[model samples]
Target: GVEIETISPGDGRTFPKKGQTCVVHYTGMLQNGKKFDSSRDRNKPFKFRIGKQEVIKGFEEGAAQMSLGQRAKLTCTPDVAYGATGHPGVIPPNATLIFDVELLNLE
Candidate 1:
């Protein structure tokens, strides 16, 4: 399961739902504190449908719980992330991933 720690709470009005578009900024890191990826690097937020497989399961679950203008820290275990066979050349097998995610918008 993914462990969520809220860094900044969002508004109460809007929460994301499946099939809705979500725009977010995120930084992905390993347990060792090494960054693997970040949407911020590109200076653009990432967009995807809430329930689609466009991203990892951890991110899906994590962001689904968020609302517009929210920020949170997600600690994703292997089963929720890349699993035993993580993406090579970066994330190692069974690595616990950490993500600092901000939900910028939902529509």
Candidate 2:
């Protein structure tokens, strides 16, 4: 499972729910603090819909707990992350992942 620590819990009443699209900015890294990817670096937020399984399990769980404008740091174990066959060339197999994420928009 992934654990989320709210850094800047948004005050907005709109919570992330299934079927809704969310736009988020995130920095993903390995447990060793080596950065792998960042939406910020691209100057654009990553957008995806909930309940669609369009992203990793950990990401879906983390985003589900967020409100618009919220910021959180997540620690994800392999089971909830990329799993036994982690993203090749980006993340190692069975690797744990960490993410600093900000909920930008919900539509």
Candidate 3:
């Protein structure tokens, strides 16, 4: 199962559902705290459709519980994230990814 710890609660009840688009800022790192990816560096949030596998499973699952303006830390297992065949060059094989995500908007 995925683990999500809310850092800041959002005001709206509009949690992300399947078929909806979500905008979020996230920092992805390894268990050792080595940075891999981040939306902040680009000064823009990442946009994707929930439940459509546009992103990793852990990201989708964790984002589902978030509302607008919410922030959460997600601890993801390899199985629920990038598994045996992890992201080449960025992540090692069977890596467990940690993400700090902030939900910006949904449409």
TM-score computed on alpha carbons, candidate 2: 0.91
Model 1 worst lDDT window (10 residues) = 4-13
> Where does model 2 exceed 4 Å of error?
none
RMSD for each of the candidates: 1.3, 1.4, 1.4
Off by over 4 Å in 3: none
lDDT of 2: 0.84
Clashes by residue pair, model 1: none
For 37-105, candidate 2 gives per-residue lDDT tens digits of: 899888878878889788888888888787888898988889877678877788778888899899988
lDDT of each: 0.82, 0.84, 0.82
| Candidate 3 lDDT trough over 10 residues, lowest sum | 7-16
lDDT of 3 at 5: 82
Alpha-carbon runs more than 4 Å astray in model 1: none
TM-score of 1: 0.91
